Each structure stands twice: as structure tokens, then as C-alpha cells.
PDB file of C-alpha atoms and ligand atoms in Angstrom:
ATOM      1  CA  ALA A   1      10.572  19.546  -5.337  1.00 58.40           C
ATOM      2  CA  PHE A   2       8.394  16.083  -6.123  1.00 55.92           C
ATOM      3  CA  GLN A   3       8.997  15.567 -10.314  1.00 54.62           C
ATOM      4  CA  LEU A   4       7.263  13.009 -11.896  1.00 53.36           C
ATOM      5  CA  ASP A   5       9.070  11.113 -14.617  1.00 53.34           C
ATOM      6  CA  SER A   6      10.036  12.828 -17.914  1.00 54.12           C
ATOM      7  CA  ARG A   7       7.269  10.379 -19.738  1.00 57.49           C
ATOM      8  CA  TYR A   8       4.521  12.220 -18.184  1.00 57.01           C
ATOM      9  CA  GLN A   9       2.936  15.726 -18.207  1.00 56.45           C
ATOM     10  CA  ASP A  10       1.646  17.713 -15.174  1.00 57.27           C
ATOM     11  CA  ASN A  11       0.005  20.623 -16.540  1.00 59.08           C
ATOM     12  CA  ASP A  12      -2.770  21.323 -14.130  1.00 60.09           C
ATOM     13  CA  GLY A  13       0.123  21.211 -11.120  1.00 59.60           C
ATOM     14  CA  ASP A  14      -1.231  18.344  -8.596  1.00 58.29           C
ATOM     15  CA  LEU A  15       1.413  16.296  -9.113  1.00 55.82           C
ATOM     16  CA  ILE A  16       0.269  13.112 -10.591  1.00 54.49           C
ATOM     17  CA  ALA A  17       0.197  12.222 -14.340  1.00 55.22           C
ATOM     18  CA  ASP A  18      -2.136  14.080 -16.896  1.00 56.15           C
ATOM     19  CA  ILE A  19      -4.672  11.949 -18.381  1.00 54.88           C
ATOM     20  CA  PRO A  20      -3.575  11.983 -22.825  1.00 57.03           C
ATOM     21  CA  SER A  21      -5.486  13.785 -25.418  1.00 56.54           C
ATOM     22  CA  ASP A  22      -3.697  12.321 -27.878  1.00 51.98           C
ATOM     23  CA  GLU A  23      -5.861   9.810 -28.542  1.00 51.89           C
ATOM     24  CA  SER A  24      -3.475   7.428 -30.293  1.00 56.38           C
ATOM     25  CA  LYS A  25      -1.987   7.458 -26.710  1.00 52.26           C
ATOM     26  CA  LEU A  26      -5.015   6.439 -24.931  1.00 53.21           C
ATOM     27  CA  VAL A  27      -6.235   2.549 -23.698  1.00 54.98           C
ATOM     28  CA  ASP A  28      -9.395   0.754 -23.753  1.00 57.35           C
ATOM     29  CA  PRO A  29      -8.594  -2.755 -22.401  1.00 55.22           C
ATOM     30  CA  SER A  30     -11.135  -5.652 -23.404  1.00 58.71           C
ATOM     31  CA  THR A  31      -9.467  -7.233 -20.398  1.00 60.18           C
ATOM     32  CA  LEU A  32      -8.865  -4.362 -17.205  1.00 63.04           C
ATOM     33  CA  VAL A  33      -6.339  -6.136 -15.412  1.00 63.30           C
ATOM     34  CA  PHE A  34      -6.343  -5.464 -10.995  1.00 63.05           C
ATOM     35  CA  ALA A  35      -3.764  -5.820  -8.251  1.00 62.82           C
ATOM     36  CA  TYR A  36      -4.547  -5.208  -4.532  1.00 62.44           C
ATOM     37  CA  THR A  37      -1.127  -4.807  -2.953  1.00 62.54           C
ATOM     38  CA  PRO A  38       1.458  -7.538  -1.315  1.00 65.11           C
ATOM     39  CA  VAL A  39       1.350  -6.600   2.410  1.00 66.09           C
ATOM     40  CA  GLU A  40       0.372 -10.004   2.431  1.00 66.85           C
ATOM     41  CA  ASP A  41      -0.101 -13.158   0.019  1.00 68.43           C
ATOM     42  CA  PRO A  42      -2.048 -12.214  -2.852  1.00 70.73           C
ATOM     43  CA  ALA A  43      -4.077 -15.325  -2.432  1.00 76.05           C
ATOM     44  CA  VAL A  44      -5.564 -14.071   1.236  1.00 77.94           C
ATOM     45  CA  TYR A  45      -7.473 -11.551  -1.356  1.00 78.43           C
ATOM     46  CA  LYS A  46      -9.020 -13.144  -3.940  1.00 79.89           C
ATOM     47  CA  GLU A  47     -11.782 -14.009  -2.892  1.00 81.99           C
ATOM     48  CA  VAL A  48     -11.900 -10.506  -0.868  1.00 80.77           C
ATOM     49  CA  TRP A  49     -12.138  -8.288  -3.932  1.00 83.89           C
ATOM     50  CA  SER A  50     -13.779 -10.731  -5.948  1.00 83.54           C
ATOM     51  CA  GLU A  51     -17.261  -9.664  -5.816  1.00 84.19           C
ATOM     52  CA  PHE A  52     -15.858  -6.445  -6.469  1.00 86.06           C
ATOM     53  CA  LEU A  53     -14.341  -7.116  -9.853  1.00 84.42           C
ATOM     54  CA  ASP A  54     -17.942  -8.579 -11.363  1.00 83.48           C
ATOM     55  CA  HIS A  55     -18.757  -5.209  -9.848  1.00 87.55           C
ATOM     56  CA  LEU A  56     -16.004  -3.699 -11.679  1.00 91.32           C
ATOM     57  CA  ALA A  57     -16.563  -5.802 -14.693  1.00 94.89           C
ATOM     58  CA  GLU A  58     -20.070  -5.055 -14.755  1.00 96.29           C
ATOM     59  CA  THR A  59     -19.971  -0.763 -14.594  1.00 96.08           C
ATOM     60  CA  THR A  60     -17.304  -0.828 -17.023  1.00 94.66           C
ATOM     61  CA  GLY A  61     -18.547  -3.911 -19.954  1.00 95.77           C
ATOM     62  CA  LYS A  62     -15.206  -4.967 -19.391  1.00 93.33           C
ATOM     63  CA  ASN A  63     -13.819  -8.227 -17.973  1.00 92.87           C
ATOM     64  CA  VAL A  64     -11.647  -8.460 -15.736  1.00 92.55           C
ATOM     65  CA  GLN A  65      -8.913 -10.021 -14.504  1.00 89.75           C
ATOM     66  CA  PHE A  66      -7.113 -10.251 -10.791  1.00 94.03           C
ATOM     67  CA  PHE A  67      -3.384 -10.143 -10.711  1.00 95.40           C
ATOM     68  CA  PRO A  68      -1.402 -12.030  -7.464  1.00 98.30           C
ATOM     69  CA  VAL A  69       1.374  -9.509  -8.029  1.00 98.63           C
ATOM     70  CA  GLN A  70       4.146 -10.766  -4.974  1.00 95.77           C
ATOM     71  CA  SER A  71       6.099  -7.701  -4.799  1.00 97.91           C
ATOM     72  CA  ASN A  72       6.033  -3.880  -5.287  1.00 96.50           C
ATOM     73  CA  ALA A  73       8.969  -3.139  -7.354  1.00 98.82           C
ATOM     74  CA  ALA A  74       6.945  -6.131  -9.712  1.00 98.41           C
ATOM     75  CA  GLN A  75       3.669  -3.784  -9.384  1.00 97.47           C
ATOM     76  CA  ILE A  76       4.546  -0.529 -10.293  1.00 95.51           C
ATOM     77  CA  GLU A  77       6.592  -2.139 -13.172  1.00 93.11           C
ATOM     78  CA  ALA A  78       3.485  -4.097 -14.222  1.00 87.99           C
ATOM     79  CA  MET A  79       1.731  -0.365 -14.401  1.00 87.78           C
ATOM     80  CA  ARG A  80       4.611   1.336 -15.939  1.00 86.27           C
ATOM     81  CA  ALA A  81       4.891  -1.028 -18.555  1.00 86.90           C
ATOM     82  CA  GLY A  82       0.745  -1.285 -19.525  1.00 85.05           C
ATOM     83  CA  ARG A  83       0.047  -4.229 -18.105  1.00 84.95           C
ATOM     84  CA  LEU A  84      -1.583  -2.943 -14.728  1.00 85.18           C
ATOM     85  CA  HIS A  85      -4.643  -0.565 -15.379  1.00 87.32           C
ATOM     86  CA  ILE A  86      -6.542   0.129 -11.367  1.00 88.23           C
ATOM     87  CA  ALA A  87      -4.292  -1.275  -8.185  1.00 92.29           C
ATOM     88  CA  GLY A  88      -4.269  -0.418  -4.734  1.00 92.20           C
ATOM     89  CA  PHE A  89      -0.298   0.649  -4.075  1.00 91.05           C
ATOM     90  CA  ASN A  90       1.036   0.410  -0.702  1.00 89.69           C
ATOM     91  CA  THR A  91       1.118   3.980   1.232  1.00 88.30           C
ATOM     92  CA  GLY A  92       4.858   3.954   0.838  1.00 96.49           C
ATOM     93  CA  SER A  93       4.646   3.242  -2.700  1.00 96.37           C
ATOM     94  CA  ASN A  94       2.473   5.764  -3.943  1.00 92.40           C
ATOM     95  CA  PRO A  95       4.984   8.486  -4.781  1.00 90.88           C
ATOM     96  CA  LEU A  96       7.047   6.486  -6.641  1.00 91.42           C
ATOM     97  CA  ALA A  97       4.237   4.424  -8.528  1.00 91.06           C
ATOM     98  CA  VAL A  98       2.157   7.989  -9.141  1.00 89.17           C
ATOM     99  CA  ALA A  99       6.521   9.382 -10.389  1.00 86.96           C
ATOM    100  CA  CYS A 100       7.108   6.325 -12.117  1.00 88.53           C
ATOM    101  CA  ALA A 101       4.480   4.175 -13.131  1.00 87.72           C
ATOM    102  CA  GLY A 102       1.818   7.250 -13.841  1.00 86.62           C
ATOM    103  CA  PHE A 103      -0.724   5.812 -11.511  1.00 84.53           C
ATOM    104  CA  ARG A 104      -3.500   8.619 -10.794  1.00 84.57           C
ATOM    105  CA  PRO A 105      -4.939   8.071  -7.419  1.00 82.16           C
ATOM    106  CA  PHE A 106      -8.380   8.984  -6.488  1.00 81.27           C
ATOM    107  CA  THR A 107      -9.791   6.281  -3.302  1.00 83.50           C
ATOM    108  CA  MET A 108      -8.859   5.154  -0.057  1.00 83.18           C
ATOM    109  CA  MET A 109     -10.890   3.204   2.280  1.00 82.89           C
ATOM    110  CA  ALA A 110     -11.953   5.052   5.367  1.00 82.86           C
ATOM    111  CA  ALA A 111     -14.330   4.105   8.321  1.00 85.38           C
ATOM    112  CA  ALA A 112     -17.847   4.696   7.961  1.00 83.84           C
ATOM    113  CA  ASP A 113     -16.948   8.311   9.973  1.00 89.74           C
ATOM    114  CA  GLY A 114     -14.701   9.447   7.709  1.00 91.94           C
ATOM    115  CA  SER A 115     -11.794   8.807   9.688  1.00 89.43           C
ATOM    116  CA  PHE A 116      -9.037   6.809   8.506  1.00 84.60           C
ATOM    117  CA  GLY A 117      -5.330   5.297   8.872  1.00 86.67           C
ATOM    118  CA  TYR A 118      -2.552   3.149   9.884  1.00 85.56           C
ATOM    119  CA  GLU A 119       0.180   3.060  11.542  1.00 86.61           C
ATOM    120  CA  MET A 120       3.627   1.118  12.374  1.00 85.49           C
ATOM    121  CA  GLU A 121       4.047  -0.707  15.074  1.00 83.44           C
ATOM    122  CA  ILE A 122       7.841  -2.564  15.919  1.00 80.66           C
ATOM    123  CA  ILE A 123       6.788  -5.576  17.441  1.00 81.40           C
ATOM    124  CA  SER A 124       8.844  -8.938  19.184  1.00 85.44           C
ATOM    125  CA  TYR A 125       7.848 -12.396  20.938  1.00 83.19           C
ATOM    126  CA  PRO A 126       6.644 -12.533  24.461  1.00 82.53           C
ATOM    127  CA  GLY A 127       9.739 -13.829  25.809  1.00 83.63           C
ATOM    128  CA  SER A 128      11.723 -12.535  23.298  1.00 84.82           C
ATOM    129  CA  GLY A 129      14.371 -10.487  25.525  1.00 87.36           C
ATOM    130  CA  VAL A 130      13.131  -7.486  23.132  1.00 89.38           C
ATOM    131  CA  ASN A 131      11.044  -5.821  25.415  1.00 88.13           C
ATOM    132  CA  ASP A 132      11.234  -2.110  24.692  1.00 90.91           C
ATOM    133  CA  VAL A 133      12.738  -0.557  20.933  1.00 92.27           C
ATOM    134  CA  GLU A 134      16.027  -0.137  22.848  1.00 92.39           C
ATOM    135  CA  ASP A 135      16.376  -3.478  22.783  1.00 94.73           C
ATOM    136  CA  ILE A 136      17.078  -4.129  19.680  1.00 94.68           C
ATOM    137  CA  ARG A 137      20.396  -2.190  19.707  1.00 92.62           C
ATOM    138  CA  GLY A 138      22.373  -4.874  18.934  1.00 92.89           C
ATOM    139  CA  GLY A 139      20.248  -6.761  17.472  1.00 93.69           C
ATOM    140  CA  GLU A 140      18.780  -7.550  13.960  1.00 95.21           C
ATOM    141  CA  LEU A 141      15.301  -5.691  12.428  1.00 96.45           C
ATOM    142  CA  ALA A 142      13.382  -7.347  10.037  1.00 96.31           C
ATOM    143  CA  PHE A 143      12.250  -4.940   7.499  1.00 96.23           C
ATOM    144  CA  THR A 144       9.518  -5.665   4.696  1.00 94.65           C
ATOM    145  CA  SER A 145      10.387  -4.131   1.463  1.00 97.40           C
ATOM    146  CA  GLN A 146      12.353  -0.680   0.663  1.00 95.08           C
ATOM    147  CA  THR A 147       8.994   0.945  -0.644  1.00 94.50           C
ATOM    148  CA  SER A 148       7.554   0.427   2.616  1.00 95.46           C
ATOM    149  CA  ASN A 149       6.240   3.055   4.645  1.00 91.56           C
ATOM    150  CA  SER A 150       6.232   1.747   7.829  1.00 90.46           C
ATOM    151  CA  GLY A 151       8.196  -1.364   6.851  1.00 89.07           C
ATOM    152  CA  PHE A 152      11.085   0.136   6.449  1.00 87.83           C
ATOM    153  CA  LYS A 153      11.381   4.139   5.933  1.00 90.90           C
ATOM    154  CA  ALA A 154       9.206   5.210   8.608  1.00 92.63           C
ATOM    155  CA  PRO A 155      10.764   2.716  11.151  1.00 90.66           C
ATOM    156  CA  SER A 156      14.510   3.911   9.437  1.00 91.76           C
ATOM    157  CA  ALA A 157      13.594   7.291  10.147  1.00 91.15           C
ATOM    158  CA  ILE A 158      11.687   7.056  13.589  1.00 91.56           C
ATOM    159  CA  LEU A 159      14.706   4.681  14.833  1.00 96.36           C
ATOM    160  CA  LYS A 160      18.029   7.786  13.502  1.00 94.88           C
ATOM    161  CA  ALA A 161      16.137  10.219  14.907  1.00 95.77           C
ATOM    162  CA  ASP A 162      14.605   9.578  17.980  1.00 97.01           C
ATOM    163  CA  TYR A 163      16.836   6.441  19.063  1.00 95.77           C
ATOM    164  CA  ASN A 164      20.426   7.069  17.596  1.00 97.33           C
ATOM    165  CA  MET A 165      20.025   4.104  15.880  1.00 98.11           C
ATOM    166  CA  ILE A 166      21.001   3.555  12.316  1.00101.35           C
ATOM    167  CA  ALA A 167      21.204   0.171   9.976  1.00100.24           C
ATOM    168  CA  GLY A 168      24.461  -1.043   9.321  1.00100.59           C
ATOM    169  CA  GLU A 169      26.465   0.516  12.805  1.00100.28           C
ATOM    170  CA  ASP A 170      23.568  -0.416  15.796  1.00103.25           C
ATOM    171  CA  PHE A 171      21.576  -3.250  14.223  1.00105.78           C
ATOM    172  CA  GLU A 172      21.781  -5.310  11.592  1.00104.93           C
ATOM    173  CA  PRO A 173      18.619  -5.453   9.561  1.00106.55           C
ATOM    174  CA  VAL A 174      16.964  -7.793   7.138  1.00104.10           C
ATOM    175  CA  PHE A 175      14.481  -8.177   4.794  1.00106.12           C
ATOM    176  CA  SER A 176      10.926 -10.780   4.896  1.00103.80           C
ATOM    177  CA  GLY A 177       9.685  -9.082   1.480  1.00103.51           C
ATOM    178  CA  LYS A 178       6.240  -8.949   2.898  1.00105.11           C
ATOM    179  CA  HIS A 179       4.134  -7.579   6.155  1.00104.81           C
ATOM    180  CA  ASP A 180       2.619 -11.137   6.697  1.00101.82           C
ATOM    181  CA  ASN A 181       6.647 -12.717   6.176  1.00102.14           C
ATOM    182  CA  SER A 182       7.525  -9.924   9.065  1.00102.07           C
ATOM    183  CA  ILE A 183       4.699 -10.819  11.441  1.00102.77           C
ATOM    184  CA  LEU A 184       4.352 -14.542  10.785  1.00105.49           C
ATOM    185  CA  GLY A 185       8.297 -14.969  11.333  1.00104.36           C
ATOM    186  CA  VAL A 186       8.108 -12.903  14.709  1.00103.47           C
ATOM    187  CA  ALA A 187       5.228 -15.037  15.661  1.00103.50           C
ATOM    188  CA  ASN A 188       7.493 -18.209  14.670  1.00105.99           C
ATOM    189  CA  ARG A 189      10.407 -16.605  16.660  1.00102.81           C
ATOM    190  CA  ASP A 190      12.736 -16.038  13.193  1.00104.92           C
ATOM    191  CA  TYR A 191      12.845 -12.313  14.132  1.00107.66           C
ATOM    192  CA  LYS A 192      12.957 -10.605  17.513  1.00105.21           C
ATOM    193  CA  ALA A 193      11.897  -7.492  16.262  1.00108.40           C
ATOM    194  CA  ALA A 194       9.873  -6.308  12.864  1.00109.91           C
ATOM    195  CA  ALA A 195       8.177  -3.010  11.899  1.00111.20           C
ATOM    196  CA  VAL A 196       5.075  -3.672  10.189  1.00111.27           C
ATOM    197  CA  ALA A 197       1.503  -1.981   9.456  1.00110.82           C
ATOM    198  CA  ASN A 198      -0.721  -2.216  12.523  1.00108.25           C
ATOM    199  CA  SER A 199      -3.820  -2.578   9.943  1.00111.66           C
ATOM    200  CA  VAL A 200      -1.766  -5.580   8.240  1.00112.43           C
ATOM    201  CA  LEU A 201      -1.430  -7.167  11.471  1.00111.10           C
ATOM    202  CA  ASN A 202      -5.122  -6.617  13.090  1.00110.59           C
ATOM    203  CA  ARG A 203      -6.378  -8.434  10.033  1.00108.00           C
ATOM    204  CA  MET A 204      -3.753 -11.828  10.254  1.00108.08           C
ATOM    205  CA  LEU A 205      -4.524 -12.036  13.576  1.00107.19           C
ATOM    206  CA  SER A 206      -8.977 -11.480  13.105  1.00107.92           C
ATOM    207  CA  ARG A 207      -7.852 -14.744  10.379  1.00107.27           C
ATOM    208  CA  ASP A 208      -6.173 -16.477  12.459  1.00105.57           C
ATOM    209  CA  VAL A 209      -3.085 -16.903  10.922  1.00104.06           C
ATOM    210  CA  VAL A 210      -0.974 -16.068  13.829  1.00104.82           C
ATOM    211  CA  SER A 211      -2.415 -15.496  17.353  1.00105.45           C
ATOM    212  CA  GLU A 212      -2.711 -12.314  19.962  1.00106.55           C
ATOM    213  CA  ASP A 213      -0.013 -13.900  22.304  1.00106.39           C
ATOM    214  CA  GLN A 214       2.709 -14.842  19.673  1.00103.93           C
ATOM    215  CA  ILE A 215       3.134 -10.912  19.525  1.00101.41           C
ATOM    216  CA  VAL A 216       3.604  -8.054  21.472  1.00 99.83           C
ATOM    217  CA  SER A 217       3.792  -4.604  20.171  1.00 96.80           C
ATOM    218  CA  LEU A 218       6.764  -1.916  21.655  1.00 93.76           C
ATOM    219  CA  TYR A 219       5.962   0.860  19.650  1.00 92.57           C
ATOM    220  CA  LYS A 220       2.902   3.050  17.556  1.00 91.33           C
ATOM    221  CA  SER A 221       3.409   5.557  15.191  1.00 90.54           C
ATOM    222  CA  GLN A 222       2.096   9.126  14.197  1.00 91.52           C
ATOM    223  CA  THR A 223      -1.130   8.194  11.990  1.00 87.71           C
ATOM    224  CA  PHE A 224      -0.089   6.922   8.451  1.00 86.55           C
ATOM    225  CA  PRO A 225      -3.254   7.096   4.885  1.00 84.65           C
ATOM    226  CA  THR A 226      -3.565   3.592   4.175  1.00 84.49           C
ATOM    227  CA  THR A 227      -3.736   2.286   0.621  1.00 84.53           C
ATOM    228  CA  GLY A 228      -3.995   4.397  -1.919  1.00 84.35           C
ATOM    229  CA  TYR A 229      -6.457   3.063  -4.586  1.00 80.35           C
ATOM    230  CA  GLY A 230      -5.754   4.424  -8.612  1.00 79.01           C
ATOM    231  CA  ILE A 231      -5.935   4.082 -12.247  1.00 74.69           C
ATOM    232  CA  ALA A 232      -3.250   3.760 -15.120  1.00 76.15           C
ATOM    233  CA  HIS A 233      -3.522   7.013 -16.578  1.00 74.80           C
ATOM    234  CA  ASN A 234      -3.402   6.580 -20.243  1.00 76.01           C
ATOM    235  CA  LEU A 235      -7.036   4.949 -20.052  1.00 78.20           C
ATOM    236  CA  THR A 236      -9.519   6.197 -21.901  1.00 77.38           C
ATOM    237  CA  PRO A 237     -11.036   9.388 -19.886  1.00 76.42           C
ATOM    238  CA  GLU A 238     -15.002   7.730 -19.988  1.00 75.62           C
ATOM    239  CA  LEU A 239     -13.258   4.164 -18.434  1.00 77.79           C
ATOM    240  CA  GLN A 240     -11.513   5.464 -15.889  1.00 82.60           C
ATOM    241  CA  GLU A 241     -14.701   7.671 -14.724  1.00 85.54           C
ATOM    242  CA  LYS A 242     -16.736   4.157 -15.125  1.00 86.62           C
ATOM    243  CA  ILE A 243     -13.566   2.688 -12.597  1.00 86.00           C
ATOM    244  CA  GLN A 244     -14.116   5.562 -10.707  1.00 85.82           C
ATOM    245  CA  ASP A 245     -17.240   5.185  -9.863  1.00 86.75           C
ATOM    246  CA  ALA A 246     -17.655   1.212 -10.441  1.00 87.81           C
ATOM    247  CA  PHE A 247     -15.519   2.128  -6.842  1.00 87.56           C
ATOM    248  CA  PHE A 248     -18.237   4.377  -5.396  1.00 88.53           C
ATOM    249  CA  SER A 249     -21.010   2.647  -5.950  1.00 90.20           C
ATOM    250  CA  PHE A 250     -20.033  -0.666  -5.433  1.00 89.68           C
ATOM    251  CA  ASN A 251     -22.510  -2.237  -1.916  1.00 90.82           C
ATOM    252  CA  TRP A 252     -20.563  -3.425   0.616  1.00 88.97           C
ATOM    253  CA  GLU A 253     -22.950  -5.082   2.829  1.00 88.48           C
ATOM    254  CA  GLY A 254     -22.873  -8.588   3.678  1.00 87.40           C
ATOM    255  CA  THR A 255     -19.997  -9.025   1.067  1.00 88.36           C
ATOM    256  CA  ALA A 256     -16.414 -10.545   1.705  1.00 89.48           C
ATOM    257  CA  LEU A 257     -14.798  -7.470   0.937  1.00 94.07           C
ATOM    258  CA  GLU A 258     -17.023  -5.455   4.102  1.00 87.09           C
ATOM    259  CA  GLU A 259     -15.594  -9.267   6.263  1.00 88.32           C
ATOM    260  CA  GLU A 260     -12.103  -8.181   5.728  1.00 86.86           C
ATOM    261  CA  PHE A 261     -11.771  -5.330   5.920  1.00 82.19           C
ATOM    262  CA  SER A 262     -13.757  -4.379   8.320  1.00 81.26           C
ATOM    263  CA  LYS A 263     -11.052  -6.039  10.296  1.00 78.68           C
ATOM    264  CA  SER A 264      -8.812  -2.734  10.105  1.00 79.62           C
ATOM    265  CA  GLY A 265     -11.858  -0.566  10.820  1.00 80.73           C
ATOM    266  CA  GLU A 266     -13.008   0.249   6.713  1.00 79.92           C
ATOM    267  CA  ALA A 267     -16.716   0.610   5.657  1.00 78.39           C
ATOM    268  CA  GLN A 268     -16.268   2.428   2.513  1.00 75.74           C
ATOM    269  CA  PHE A 269     -14.449   4.620   0.099  1.00 78.08           C
ATOM    270  CA  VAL A 270     -13.571   7.964   0.472  1.00 80.08           C
ATOM    271  CA  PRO A 271     -11.879  10.477  -2.012  1.00 80.31           C
ATOM    272  CA  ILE A 272      -8.354  11.282  -1.449  1.00 81.84           C
ATOM    273  CA  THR A 273      -5.554  13.687  -2.664  1.00 82.12           C
ATOM    274  CA  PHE A 274      -2.033  12.847  -3.661  1.00 80.10           C
ATOM    275  CA  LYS A 275      -1.461  15.820  -3.064  1.00 80.99           C
ATOM    276  CA  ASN A 276      -2.855  16.305   0.661  1.00 78.48           C
ATOM    277  CA  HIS A 277      -2.993  13.457   2.190  1.00 78.40           C
ATOM    278  CA  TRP A 278       0.187  12.099   0.579  1.00 81.01           C
ATOM    279  CA  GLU A 279       2.307  14.948   2.338  1.00 80.02           C
ATOM    280  CA  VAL A 280       3.576  12.929   5.318  1.00 78.73           C
ATOM    281  CA  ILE A 281       4.406  10.527   3.311  1.00 79.79           C
ATOM    282  CA  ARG A 282       6.299  12.674   0.550  1.00 80.42           C
ATOM    283  CA  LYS A 283       8.070  13.892   3.731  1.00 80.33           C
ATOM    284  CA  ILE A 284       9.331  10.183   5.221  1.00 80.87           C
ATOM    285  CA  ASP A 285      10.531   9.637   1.474  1.00 81.43           C
ATOM    286  CA  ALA A 286      12.241  12.742   1.892  1.00 80.37           C
ATOM    287  CA  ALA A 287      13.633  11.977   4.852  1.00 82.05           C
ATOM    288  CA  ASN A 288      15.095   8.984   3.383  1.00 82.93           C
ATOM    289  CA  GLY A 289      16.732  10.345   0.440  1.00 80.37           C
ATOM    290  CA  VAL A 290      14.034   8.664  -1.727  1.00 82.16           C
ATOM    291  CA  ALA A 291      15.215  10.246  -5.320  1.00 82.73           C
ATOM    292  CA  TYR A 292      12.155   8.095  -7.626  1.00 82.24           C
ATOM    293  CA  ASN A 293      15.209   7.774 -10.198  1.00 80.34           C
ATOM    294  CA  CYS A 294      12.197   5.841 -12.557  1.00 83.57           C
ATOM    295  CA  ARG A 295      16.144   4.178 -14.544  1.00 84.71           C
TER     296      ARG A 295
HETATM  297  O1  1GP B   1       3.793  -1.028   3.831  1.00 82.69           O
HETATM  298  P1  1GP B   1       3.212   0.433   3.993  1.00 82.69           P
HETATM  299  O2  1GP B   1       4.141   1.371   2.580  1.00 82.69           O
HETATM  300  O3  1GP B   1       3.513   0.752   4.881  1.00 82.69           O
HETATM  301  O4  1GP B   1       1.742   0.233   3.438  1.00 82.69           O
HETATM  302  C1  1GP B   1       0.764  -0.346   4.245  1.00 82.69           C
HETATM  303  C2  1GP B   1      -0.355   0.210   3.426  1.00 82.69           C
HETATM  304  O5  1GP B   1      -0.484   0.220   2.240  1.00 82.69           O
HETATM  305  C3  1GP B   1      -2.059  -0.236   4.547  1.00 82.69           C
HETATM  306  O6  1GP B   1      -2.915   0.139   4.265  1.00 82.69           O
END
């Protein structure tokens, strides 16, 4: 029963907003605005995407601008409002971005053999006194933001279903804003427990943002699709095809993109469909009562 906002049409039944055929509704911007997902300080990813965005500019013939958005809500609103044209949305926000911002997802990173994904992990710091999930009872649990799968919705569902633990009764929730804030907060002993994306954790460890001896894992979830990449529904069809081509034609070898994302096992972009690959996420959304009320 997934529903797009009534400002979009879904004539072909693939659950994503159709490209308009009224030419007055299409946009052909002279500057394409791109945003990666704020799982971490976007300053970390500015140079990571730089060469990729140069290739995108050459492929599309447009100027390209990196938008260092700081929260999921701001990123969703920017695409809904027409200011953001191409984005990677965090896994947990793809259904909301599809429904309320007209996001058309088409690709996801994968390993060289086509395997993909990340898991939620619940982490503490060594010596915290929190040595398994059950030890969280009566204490605080750090979440990232309410649109996060691994940072809020998946751990809330797992704790309620498998550990008989609900926020406000069995633990007190706190919100850090970002995976990196949660991971840093655990490493610095601000948080005794946090639910985080282990892909982000591994790249932060590789970049020496935190050290291995500062973090202990207490739980690892099932595997989820990673960040979904896509386009605002109302760019001209010709431009959308060129953007997709730019994603698949970019040569990763020797680039800052490969240097970063090889640290969570990625090597390429592969096609996905929202209907298939995000089914597990829509179910976790429904288990948390998510409505997709765009307001
Ligand atoms: O914050 P979540 O929703 O778990 O998304 C992280 C995911 O985008 C990592 O690839």
C-alpha cells in the first residue's frame, strides 16, 4: 500500500514518480545540483565526489554544484522544492524521498562481484559497562535521525520485537544527527550505546576518524541495500538519460571515489529497482508506523 504524494503520477505502477510529458513541467537547469547523503560531515565527501562531478558535467554539458546538505530532512525538502536534482539518499530515506520528493532511484554501489549491502550494528566503547544488547536496559541509546534505517527504524523494531525494549519505557533515546556523530560520541564516551551503519563505521575507521580500540560491536543486523542514487522526476528525459550514463561510465580506477568507497567494499554502480531492492526497507518503515505524510 505504498503511496506517492498526490502531486506525482505513477501510470506504470513501479511506485516512483513518472517523468512528466507536459514540457512546461520539465526542467533543464544550467547548473545541476548534486548531494550525497549526510551520514557523515559532507566536508568528508567534497573531494571524494569531485572528479565524479567533473565527469558528470562533461557528460551532461552542464555546470555541476556539490550541495553539502547536513540533514536528511533538508535533503528531501530540497529535492521536493526543485533545488536539488541528483542525490544519493540514505537507505532509510529512499521510500520517503520517492513518495514526497519525486526521487527516481536507479543505481546503488556494489562490490566487483555484484554483492552489495551494509548492516546496522549496535556499538559501545570498551569498558563502558554495556557488554551486550540487554545491558542497554535502563540506560540511553543514541540514534541518528528518524529517517535513518540503521540509525533509528531498524534498531527500534529489533529491540521491541526481539529484546522487549521500547523507547521511553526500557531505555531513553537520544539523537546525534548523523552516523559520524554517534560513532564519535561512542568513541569519546559520550554515548554508552548507539545504533549505526557499519559501512560508515568502517570508512571512518579507515580514515582514522576513530580507532579500532575505541569501538566494540554488540549486534549486527541482516543486510540492507546501501545508499540509493537517483534523479528528480521532472528533469527532461534526455538529461536524465545522460545523468544515468555518467554514473555508469565513470572510471573509478585511481580516483578519490574508489579510495573512499573501497573501504566499505564498493567498486561499481549497479542497476536497482525501488520496488525490489527497497521492499525490506518499506517493511521496516511500516513496522515503525511511517506514513509518508508529505504534509
Ligand atoms: O542511515 P541509513 O538509513 O541506515 O542509511 C545508511 C546507508 O545509506 C548506507 O549505505
